[PDB]
Amino acid sequence: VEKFGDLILKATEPQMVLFNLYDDWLKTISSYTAFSRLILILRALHVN
Amino acid sequence: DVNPKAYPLADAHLTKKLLDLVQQSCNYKQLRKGANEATKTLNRGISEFIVMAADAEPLEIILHLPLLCEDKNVPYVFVRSKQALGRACGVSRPVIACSVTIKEGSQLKQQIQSIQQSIERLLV
Amino acid sequence: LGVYLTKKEQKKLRRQTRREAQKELQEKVRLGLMPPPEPKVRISNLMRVLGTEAVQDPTKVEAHVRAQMAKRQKAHEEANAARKLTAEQRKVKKIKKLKEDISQGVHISVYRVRNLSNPAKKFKIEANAGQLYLTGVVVLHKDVNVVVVEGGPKAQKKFKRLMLHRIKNKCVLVWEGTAKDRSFGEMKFKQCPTENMAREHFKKHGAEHYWDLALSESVLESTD
RNA sequence: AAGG
RNA sequence: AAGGUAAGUAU
RNA sequence: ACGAUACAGAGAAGAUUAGCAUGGCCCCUGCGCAAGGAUGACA
RNA sequence: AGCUUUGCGCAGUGGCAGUAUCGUAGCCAAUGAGGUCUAUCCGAGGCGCGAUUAUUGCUAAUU
Fold it and tell me: What residue stretch is flagged as signal peptide (chain C)?
């Protein structure tokens, strides 16, 4: 994902960064569905 | 008919009201079943009124309860059936004497007082 | 002459009715008249029921599970609401439980109040008697205030409790009893500056003796 | 399938 | 001398 | 009358496995039924 | 007119435990079941027998 790659490449010193991969998902679906959707998205990103 | 020894016998309407109050008292944990428990409640002065059946054979096994009621100033009444009285108490077995105990703050206090007034004006 | 049921009897009845219903449903399913029941699925039950399906289509499976849960909730609400007392029907049950049968007899209570000047108290008495179907009369004098109340024993008890504890000069019950038939209508709150016409009005209904008792008791209290 |  | 038999189906 | 042959040979173990609903118990919520409690309201 | 108590149903959600849940044209039981403690006091089921994966169904696999 560009938002992580550009951030890491642009970084000059180590630092702890907190993100949220369930940005607007818990407002409408359970965390069980959010995790499965995110893992599907990540699998698709890795594969192609 | 019924034994004349049971002179304070209730009519049908009062019988229904008494059985309803006995069932409500059983639901409120305010009832004692049996002649022995009625005697115990009378001796401890925690009895509102005593309901006893007119089919007890012999009836003399509960005729001591009116005397204890008079001594302790507690109203008493006779119902025509020992099987319906037992059912009202929540027990399938016949009951020949049930005692409604005194519980402060109970929601049945007004009904208990009304039944006491009805009984105390029916004996004669 | 109804027969009550013990708690064991009630448990037996409920258990055997539920068992009969379950057996009937199972027979309907086996015979083919009813489709087999689908497993009940919740959010915590989603993966345990369809993990294979939840992996491929997470949002679709989530939507299906939530649709089943919403269907169950909708069925529950429809059952509850379908069997709900109409707003007018609620009044009909209430308007009837408070209507005692005065065919057998009417219970009459007579009250004497030292002072009844407060309009709020007048409205309280009038409304409470009207709701409880307590037909009667209120006669206002300098000291005597005869409140004849006739109706049902439950309404009589409620109204006696009303002026004994809910409403505050003092309130005294003159005489509580029964008569064959009613003799007064709705609350009127007649004003009676003098005793003669108050007695005449009570004689119109044929209940002057209530006025006599109230006047005599008030005189005795004044002398005491 | 073969032996006493 | 034993306590050391596989149970078979075919030919 | 065995045995030799050809074949099989794990020649000693219900080893089962998950899901849901019922059932028991204990609340909570809604609705119905039958009873009841306490209180408020001026012309 | 609201509010609220008790009991009974009907459902919904949730929690807990499977050494336990039922069955009683068997017997006994408030005319007293059962009592180690509190006994001139306690007050309700007990026992025997039967069912069982210590309630019972479907569903999915392998078969």
Answer: none
